[PDB]
Amino acid sequence: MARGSVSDEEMMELREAFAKVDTDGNGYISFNELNDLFKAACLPLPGYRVREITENLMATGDLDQDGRISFDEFIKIFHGLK
Numbered sequence: 326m327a328r329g330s331v332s333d334e335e336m337m338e339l340r341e342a343f344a345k346v347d348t349d350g351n352g353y354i355s356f357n358e359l360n361d362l363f364k365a366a367c368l369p370l371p372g373y374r375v376r377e378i379t380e381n382l383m384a385t386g387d388l389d390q391d392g393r394i395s396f397d398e399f400i401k402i403f404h405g406l407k
Contacts, residue, residue, distance in 0.1 A: 330400045339403065342366035343396050353395035356380075368403065378402050 342365045346358035363375040
């Protein structure tokens with residue numbers, strides 16, 4: 326797979342933390358892991374912002390693939406840009 330959004334700096338940091346919480350061995354983390362990863366990665370967005378974006382993401386049909394959250398989703402969520 327090849328895709329990204331966050332700048333090099335973040336991409337490196339965000340990825341670092343994500344992996345630490347991506348022990349699912351599938352490549353994607355879980356809801357709980359996501360939120361924890363956001364705060365663990367020393368991100369700007371608060372705690373509710375993340376939990377909200379997620380619960381609101383699949384709220385329609387974003388995580389309908391299974392319910393998990395791959396690094397890709399996290400990034401697109403951290404930047405919140407098409």
